[PDB]
Coordinates of C-alpha atoms in Angstrom, one line a residue:
Chain A
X1 CA -0.1 -0.1 0.2
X2 CA 1.0 3.6 0.6
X3 CA 4.5 5.0 1.8
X4 CA 4.9 8.0 3.9
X5 CA 8.0 10.2 4.0
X6 CA 8.7 12.9 6.9
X7 CA 10.9 15.5 5.8
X8 CA 12.4 16.6 2.5
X9 CA 15.9 16.3 1.2
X10 CA 18.1 15.2 -1.9
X11 CA 17.7 11.5 -0.6
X12 CA 13.9 11.6 -0.5
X13 CA 13.6 13.3 -3.7
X14 CA 15.7 10.3 -5.3
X15 CA 13.7 8.0 -3.3
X16 CA 10.3 9.3 -4.9
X17 CA 11.8 8.9 -8.6
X18 CA 12.2 5.0 -7.5
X19 CA 8.5 5.0 -5.9
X20 CA 6.7 6.5 -8.9
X21 CA 3.6 4.4 -9.7
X22 CA 3.3 3.8 -5.9
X23 CA 1.3 6.0 -3.5
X24 CA 3.2 8.2 -1.6
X25 CA 2.6 11.0 1.0
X26 CA 5.5 13.6 2.0
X27 CA 4.7 15.6 5.3
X28 CA 7.0 18.4 6.0
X29 CA 7.1 21.9 7.3
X30 CA 8.7 23.8 4.6
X31 CA 6.2 24.7 1.9
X32 CA 9.0 25.7 -0.4
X33 CA 9.2 22.1 -1.0
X34 CA 5.5 21.5 -2.3
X35 CA 6.2 22.3 -5.7
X36 CA 9.1 19.6 -6.3
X37 CA 7.2 17.2 -4.1
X38 CA 4.1 17.3 -6.3
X39 CA 6.2 17.3 -9.4
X40 CA 7.9 14.1 -8.2
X41 CA 4.7 12.5 -7.7
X42 CA 4.1 12.4 -4.2
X43 CA 1.1 14.0 -2.5
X44 CA 2.3 16.9 -0.3
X45 CA 1.1 17.2 3.3
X46 CA 2.1 20.4 5.0
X47 CA 2.6 19.8 8.6
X48 CA 4.7 19.1 11.6
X49 CA 6.4 15.6 11.4
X50 CA 7.0 15.5 15.1
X51 CA 3.1 16.0 15.8
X52 CA 0.8 12.9 16.1
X53 CA -2.3 14.6 14.4
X54 CA -0.3 15.6 11.6
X55 CA 1.6 12.4 11.1
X56 CA -2.2 10.9 11.1
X57 CA -3.6 13.3 8.7
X58 CA -0.3 12.1 6.4
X59 CA -1.9 8.6 6.5
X60 CA 0.9 6.9 8.7
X61 CA -1.6 4.7 10.2
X62 CA -1.5 1.3 8.2
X63 CA 1.2 2.6 6.1
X64 CA 3.5 -0.1 4.4
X65 CA 6.6 2.2 5.8
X66 CA 7.6 5.5 6.8
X67 CA 11.0 6.8 5.8
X68 CA 12.0 9.7 8.1
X69 CA 14.7 12.1 7.0
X70 CA 15.1 15.5 9.0
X71 CA 18.0 17.6 9.6
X72 CA 17.4 17.5 13.5
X73 CA 18.4 14.4 15.3
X74 CA 16.0 15.4 17.9
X75 CA 13.2 15.8 15.5
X76 CA 14.0 12.4 13.7
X77 CA 13.6 10.9 17.1
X78 CA 10.4 12.9 18.0
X79 CA 9.0 11.9 14.7
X80 CA 9.8 8.1 15.4
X81 CA 8.3 8.1 18.6
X82 CA 5.1 10.0 17.3
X83 CA 4.9 7.1 14.5
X84 CA 5.0 4.7 17.1
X85 CA 2.3 6.1 19.1
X86 CA 0.1 5.9 16.1
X87 CA 1.2 2.4 14.5
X88 CA 3.3 -0.1 16.1
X89 CA 3.6 -2.4 13.1
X90 CA 4.7 0.0 10.4
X91 CA 8.3 -0.1 9.4
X92 CA 10.3 2.6 10.1
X93 CA 13.5 3.7 8.0
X94 CA 15.5 6.8 9.5
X95 CA 18.3 8.7 7.8
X96 CA 21.2 9.2 10.1
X97 CA 23.6 12.0 9.4
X98 CA 26.1 11.4 12.2
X99 CA 27.2 8.1 13.3
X100 CA 26.7 8.7 16.9
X101 CA 23.0 9.0 16.4
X102 CA 22.2 5.8 14.6
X103 CA 21.8 4.1 18.0
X104 CA 19.5 6.8 19.5
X105 CA 17.3 6.2 16.6
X106 CA 17.3 2.4 17.2
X107 CA 16.4 3.2 20.8
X108 CA 13.4 5.4 19.5
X109 CA 12.2 2.6 17.7
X110 CA 13.5 2.9 14.1
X111 CA 13.6 -0.6 12.3
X112 CA 16.3 0.5 10.0
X113 CA 18.9 3.2 9.9
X114 CA 20.5 4.5 6.6
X115 CA 23.7 6.6 6.8
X116 CA 24.6 8.4 3.6
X117 CA 27.8 9.7 4.8
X118 CA 28.9 6.2 6.1
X119 CA 28.5 4.9 2.7
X120 CA 30.1 7.8 1.0
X121 CA 32.8 7.8 3.3
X122 CA 33.6 4.2 2.5
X123 CA 33.2 4.6 -1.3
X124 CA 35.6 7.3 -1.0
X125 CA 38.3 5.3 0.9
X126 CA 37.6 2.4 -1.7
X127 CA 38.0 4.8 -4.7
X128 CA 41.9 5.8 -4.2
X129 CA 43.1 3.8 -7.1
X130 CA 39.9 3.4 -9.6
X131 CA 36.2 3.5 -9.4
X132 CA 34.9 -0.1 -10.0
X133 CA 33.4 -0.7 -6.4
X134 CA 31.7 2.7 -6.6
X135 CA 30.6 1.7 -10.3
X136 CA 29.2 -1.6 -8.9
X137 CA 27.1 -0.1 -6.0
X138 CA 25.8 2.5 -8.5
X139 CA 24.9 0.1 -11.6
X140 CA 23.2 -2.4 -9.4
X141 CA 21.0 0.1 -7.8
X142 CA 20.4 2.4 -11.2
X143 CA 16.7 1.3 -11.8
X144 CA 17.2 -0.5 -15.1
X145 CA 20.8 -1.1 -16.2
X146 CA 22.0 -4.3 -17.6
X147 CA 22.2 -6.4 -14.5
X148 CA 20.7 -5.1 -11.4
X149 CA 20.4 -6.1 -7.7
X150 CA 16.8 -7.6 -6.6
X151 CA 15.5 -9.3 -3.7
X152 CA 12.9 -12.2 -4.1
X153 CA 11.0 -13.9 -1.0
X154 CA 10.7 -17.7 -0.8
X155 CA 7.0 -18.1 -0.8
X156 CA 5.2 -20.7 1.5
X157 CA 5.3 -24.0 -0.3
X158 CA 8.0 -22.5 -2.6
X159 CA 9.8 -25.0 -5.3
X160 CA 13.1 -24.6 -3.2
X161 CA 11.4 -24.7 0.2
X162 CA 13.4 -27.2 1.9
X163 CA 16.1 -27.3 -0.8
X164 CA 20.0 -26.9 -0.4
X165 CA 22.0 -23.9 -1.9
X166 CA 24.0 -26.6 -3.6
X167 CA 21.0 -28.6 -4.6
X168 CA 19.3 -25.4 -6.0
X169 CA 22.6 -24.3 -8.2
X170 CA 20.5 -20.8 -8.8
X171 CA 23.2 -19.5 -10.6
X172 CA 23.7 -22.0 -13.3
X173 CA 20.1 -22.4 -13.5
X174 CA 18.9 -19.1 -13.8
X175 CA 22.1 -17.0 -14.3
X176 CA 21.4 -14.9 -11.4
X177 CA 24.4 -14.4 -8.9
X178 CA 23.4 -15.2 -5.4
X179 CA 25.0 -12.5 -3.1
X180 CA 23.3 -13.3 0.1
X181 CA 20.0 -14.7 1.9
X182 CA 18.2 -12.6 4.2
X183 CA 16.3 -14.3 7.2
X184 CA 15.0 -12.8 10.3
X185 CA 16.6 -9.2 10.1
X186 CA 20.0 -10.9 9.3
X187 CA 21.7 -11.2 6.0
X188 CA 23.8 -14.3 5.4
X189 CA 26.3 -13.7 2.4
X190 CA 27.7 -16.6 0.3
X191 CA 25.8 -19.2 2.5
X192 CA 27.2 -22.7 2.8
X193 CA 26.4 -25.3 0.3
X194 CA 24.3 -27.0 3.0
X195 CA 22.3 -23.7 3.7
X196 CA 18.5 -24.9 3.3
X197 CA 16.1 -22.3 1.8
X198 CA 13.0 -21.6 4.1
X199 CA 9.7 -19.9 3.4
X200 CA 10.0 -16.1 4.2
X201 CA 13.6 -16.3 3.3
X202 CA 14.9 -13.3 1.2
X203 CA 17.1 -14.1 -1.7
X204 CA 19.6 -11.1 -2.8
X205 CA 20.8 -11.4 -6.5
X206 CA 22.0 -10.0 -9.4
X207 CA 21.0 -10.3 -12.7
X208 CA 19.3 -9.3 -16.0
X209 CA 15.4 -9.1 -16.3
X210 CA 15.3 -12.4 -18.1
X211 CA 17.4 -14.0 -15.4
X212 CA 15.4 -12.6 -12.7
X213 CA 12.2 -13.6 -14.4
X214 CA 13.7 -17.0 -14.5
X215 CA 14.6 -17.0 -10.6
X216 CA 11.0 -16.0 -10.0
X217 CA 9.7 -18.9 -11.6
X218 CA 12.3 -21.4 -10.1
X219 CA 11.4 -19.9 -6.7
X220 CA 7.6 -20.2 -7.6
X221 CA 5.3 -22.1 -4.9
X222 CA 3.7 -25.2 -6.0
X223 CA 0.3 -24.4 -5.6
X224 CA -3.1 -23.5 -7.5
Chain B
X1 CA 52.2 7.8 -1.1
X2 CA 50.0 10.1 0.7
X3 CA 46.2 11.0 0.0
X4 CA 45.0 14.5 0.3
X5 CA 41.3 15.2 1.6
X6 CA 39.7 18.5 0.9
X7 CA 37.3 19.6 3.2
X8 CA 35.8 18.2 6.6
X9 CA 32.6 16.2 6.9
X10 CA 30.8 13.0 8.0
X11 CA 31.8 11.5 4.9
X12 CA 35.6 12.5 4.8
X13 CA 35.5 11.2 8.5
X14 CA 34.6 7.8 7.8
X15 CA 36.6 7.7 5.0
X16 CA 39.5 8.9 7.3
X17 CA 38.9 6.2 9.6
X18 CA 38.9 3.5 6.8
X19 CA 42.2 4.8 5.8
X20 CA 43.8 4.4 9.3
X21 CA 47.6 3.6 9.0
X22 CA 48.2 5.6 6.0
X23 CA 49.4 9.0 5.5
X24 CA 46.5 11.5 5.0
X25 CA 46.5 15.1 4.8
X26 CA 43.2 16.8 5.8
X27 CA 42.9 20.7 4.4
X28 CA 40.1 22.9 5.8
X29 CA 39.3 26.4 7.1
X30 CA 38.4 25.6 10.6
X31 CA 41.2 24.9 13.1
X32 CA 38.7 23.1 15.3
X33 CA 38.9 20.5 12.8
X34 CA 42.5 19.9 13.7
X35 CA 42.0 18.0 17.0
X36 CA 39.3 15.8 15.6
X37 CA 41.5 15.2 12.8
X38 CA 44.8 14.4 14.5
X39 CA 43.2 12.0 16.6
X40 CA 41.7 9.9 13.5
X41 CA 45.5 9.6 12.7
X42 CA 45.5 12.4 9.9
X43 CA 47.6 15.2 9.6
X44 CA 45.7 18.7 9.6
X45 CA 46.3 21.8 7.2
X46 CA 44.7 24.7 8.0
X47 CA 43.8 26.3 4.8
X48 CA 41.4 27.0 1.9
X49 CA 40.9 24.0 -0.4
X50 CA 39.7 26.6 -3.1
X51 CA 43.1 28.4 -3.0
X52 CA 46.0 27.0 -5.1
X53 CA 48.5 27.9 -2.5
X54 CA 46.9 26.1 0.4
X55 CA 46.2 23.2 -2.0
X56 CA 50.2 23.0 -2.6
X57 CA 50.2 23.4 1.3
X58 CA 48.5 20.5 1.7
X59 CA 50.7 18.4 -0.6
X60 CA 48.4 17.8 -3.4
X61 CA 51.2 17.7 -6.4
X62 CA 52.3 13.9 -6.2
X63 CA 49.5 12.9 -3.8
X64 CA 48.4 9.4 -4.7
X65 CA 44.4 10.7 -4.7
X66 CA 42.7 13.8 -3.9
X67 CA 39.4 13.3 -2.1
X68 CA 37.0 16.3 -2.3
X69 CA 34.0 17.3 -0.2
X70 CA 33.5 20.9 0.5
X71 CA 30.4 22.9 1.7
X72 CA 28.7 23.2 -1.8
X73 CA 29.0 21.6 -5.2
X74 CA 30.3 25.2 -6.2
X75 CA 33.2 24.9 -3.9
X76 CA 33.9 21.4 -4.6
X77 CA 34.1 22.4 -8.2
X78 CA 36.3 25.4 -7.3
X79 CA 38.6 23.2 -5.4
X80 CA 38.7 20.6 -8.3
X81 CA 39.7 23.4 -10.6
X82 CA 42.4 24.5 -8.3
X83 CA 43.8 20.9 -7.9
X84 CA 44.0 20.4 -11.8
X85 CA 46.3 23.6 -12.0
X86 CA 48.5 21.8 -9.9
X87 CA 48.5 18.3 -10.8
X88 CA 46.4 17.3 -14.4
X89 CA 47.2 13.5 -13.7
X90 CA 46.5 13.0 -9.9
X91 CA 43.3 10.8 -9.2
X92 CA 40.3 13.1 -8.1
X93 CA 37.2 11.9 -6.3
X94 CA 34.6 14.4 -5.4
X95 CA 31.3 14.1 -3.6
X96 CA 28.3 15.5 -5.2
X97 CA 25.4 17.1 -3.1
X98 CA 23.0 17.1 -6.2
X99 CA 22.3 15.1 -9.1
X100 CA 22.6 18.2 -11.2
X101 CA 26.0 19.1 -10.7
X102 CA 27.6 15.8 -11.3
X103 CA 28.7 16.6 -14.8
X104 CA 30.1 20.2 -13.8
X105 CA 32.1 18.3 -11.2
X106 CA 33.3 15.8 -13.9
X107 CA 34.2 18.7 -16.5
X108 CA 36.2 20.6 -13.8
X109 CA 38.2 17.7 -13.9
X110 CA 37.0 14.9 -11.1
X111 CA 37.8 11.3 -12.1
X112 CA 35.0 10.1 -10.2
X113 CA 31.9 11.8 -8.5
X114 CA 30.2 10.2 -5.6
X115 CA 26.2 11.3 -4.9
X116 CA 25.6 10.1 -1.4
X117 CA 22.0 11.2 -1.7
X118 CA 21.3 9.2 -4.9
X119 CA 22.6 6.2 -3.4
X120 CA 20.7 6.8 -0.2
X121 CA 17.6 7.6 -1.9
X122 CA 17.7 4.3 -3.7
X123 CA 18.3 2.4 -0.7
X124 CA 15.2 4.0 1.0
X125 CA 13.1 2.9 -1.9
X126 CA 14.4 -0.7 -1.4
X127 CA 14.1 -0.8 2.3
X128 CA 10.2 -0.5 2.2
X129 CA 9.7 -4.2 3.3
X130 CA 13.1 -5.0 4.9
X131 CA 16.7 -3.7 5.0
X132 CA 18.7 -6.5 3.3
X133 CA 19.8 -4.7 0.2
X134 CA 20.8 -1.6 2.5
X135 CA 22.5 -4.1 4.9
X136 CA 24.6 -5.6 1.9
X137 CA 25.7 -2.4 0.5
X138 CA 26.9 -0.9 4.0
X139 CA 28.5 -4.1 5.0
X140 CA 30.5 -4.9 1.8
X141 CA 31.9 -1.2 1.5
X142 CA 33.2 -2.0 5.3
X143 CA 37.1 -2.8 5.2
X144 CA 36.2 -4.6 8.4
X145 CA 33.4 -6.7 7.8
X146 CA 33.9 -10.7 8.0
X147 CA 32.7 -11.1 4.3
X148 CA 33.8 -8.0 2.4
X149 CA 34.0 -6.7 -1.1
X150 CA 37.5 -6.7 -2.5
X151 CA 39.8 -5.6 -5.7
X152 CA 42.2 -8.0 -6.9
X153 CA 44.2 -7.0 -10.2
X154 CA 45.6 -9.7 -12.4
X155 CA 49.3 -9.5 -12.3
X156 CA 51.7 -9.5 -15.1
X157 CA 52.3 -12.8 -16.5
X158 CA 49.4 -14.2 -14.4
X159 CA 48.5 -17.9 -14.8
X160 CA 44.8 -16.6 -15.3
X161 CA 46.3 -14.5 -18.4
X162 CA 44.1 -15.7 -21.3
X163 CA 42.0 -18.1 -19.4
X164 CA 38.2 -17.9 -19.3
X165 CA 36.0 -17.4 -16.5
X166 CA 34.5 -21.0 -16.7
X167 CA 38.3 -22.5 -16.7
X168 CA 39.4 -20.3 -13.7
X169 CA 36.5 -21.5 -11.6
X170 CA 37.4 -19.1 -9.1
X171 CA 34.5 -19.8 -6.4
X172 CA 35.0 -23.2 -5.9
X173 CA 38.8 -23.0 -6.0
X174 CA 39.1 -20.1 -3.3
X175 CA 35.6 -19.3 -2.2
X176 CA 35.5 -15.9 -3.6
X177 CA 32.1 -15.0 -5.1
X178 CA 33.1 -13.0 -8.3
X179 CA 30.8 -10.1 -8.8
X180 CA 32.8 -8.4 -11.7
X181 CA 35.8 -7.3 -13.4
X182 CA 37.3 -4.0 -14.0
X183 CA 39.2 -3.3 -17.3
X184 CA 39.7 0.2 -18.5
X185 CA 36.6 2.5 -18.1
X186 CA 34.1 -0.3 -17.9
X187 CA 33.0 -2.8 -15.1
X188 CA 31.6 -6.2 -16.2
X189 CA 29.3 -7.6 -13.9
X190 CA 29.1 -11.5 -13.8
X191 CA 31.3 -11.9 -17.0
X192 CA 30.0 -14.7 -19.2
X193 CA 31.9 -18.3 -18.6
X194 CA 33.5 -17.3 -22.1
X195 CA 35.2 -14.3 -20.7
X196 CA 39.0 -14.3 -20.9
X197 CA 41.0 -12.5 -18.3
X198 CA 44.1 -10.3 -19.0
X199 CA 47.0 -9.0 -16.7
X200 CA 45.7 -5.3 -15.4
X201 CA 42.1 -6.6 -15.1
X202 CA 40.5 -5.8 -11.6
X203 CA 38.8 -8.7 -10.1
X204 CA 35.8 -7.6 -7.8
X205 CA 35.1 -10.4 -5.3
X206 CA 33.1 -10.9 -1.8
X207 CA 34.5 -13.5 0.6
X208 CA 36.4 -13.7 4.1
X209 CA 40.1 -12.8 4.2
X210 CA 41.2 -16.7 4.0
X211 CA 39.1 -16.9 0.8
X212 CA 40.7 -13.3 -0.5
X213 CA 44.2 -14.7 0.1
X214 CA 43.7 -17.8 -1.9
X215 CA 42.2 -15.8 -4.8
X216 CA 45.5 -13.8 -4.5
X217 CA 47.9 -16.3 -4.5
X218 CA 45.8 -18.4 -7.1
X219 CA 45.9 -15.3 -9.6
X220 CA 49.7 -14.9 -9.5

């Protein structure tokens, strides 16, 4: 369903570009952004992201997720708490500008924290001789390039449910590179040949559309 | 050879941390930055990154690479221009705050442009259900993860010279999962089994240190 974004910045703008076709509500105090927000395809809700009543009129309750990106560390936390007073289920992803705050966001109830500068800093250190690593990260994330990164859940009653990674041989079968498996908020990279896929497991891979579609079929569940 | 970082920020700080144990010169206008920098193990140079004299003062000429991240893209660009007047060959990596300025930074002379907000925004859109992709990206770029991404060049006369991907059997042989090959200006992700390696090629892989070492010895 719908996604709510609290605040506005270059990150959320790029995020909207990726969420077009999806119903998105942007709640922010700076009306100067209404134009850009509306152009970007999102519904603009003028209001205070740290206020429960405004979060509510922004349709936070029942949202699929709420992305929080406010300049103030304090406001981000107050926003998180406000969201939590409305809906305890909704996934909350918060942007952090300082490493020192990542845990306070966690404490407040954020399910995930994205730190643009940690990522930027590491790409800088990895780009001293060439930019292949930076290129990788950018390519696999560029919505529609030769090969892209995707995640596919292993549905209940999946064809591979109970099968081993070795027995699966997903790469030779589909052509998709398996970079990891997500299970219970934990990512297992390059799992042992004896790792057995289970429903709910999330497969992270890199491949072409055809290869991806092939993976979807290979992971489909045996049900009418 | 040393590395110069122009500007001070959370990004350059994380970079500085990842470069622990290497000679680094940080050039910035605020003396306050001094202490915070000297600690992290970097040498501080009090000066203006947009001023050529101060850039020279920071030892840019001859540097292994120059990382640029100033207040605005305008200043960043001014810095790059400054660096190019000194060393037209030194590698320049610059952070861009806006997608619109990327081209300008490149034109000014930046060899590479990092747009943290474009990456972050993309991760945001991919974390609506879970954060595995975001988790993947931040872990692999960490030089301290158990399984991290690494670059390994094919040395001259390598035994992998002219050998196809298939015949190299690198994953089974070392345990390192190969994600791509860096050759020239292009990056080939998941090269076809019929891809022949060459000296100079850069192999991008992911694995534990042990797996990494096996790949290094195997490529000799």
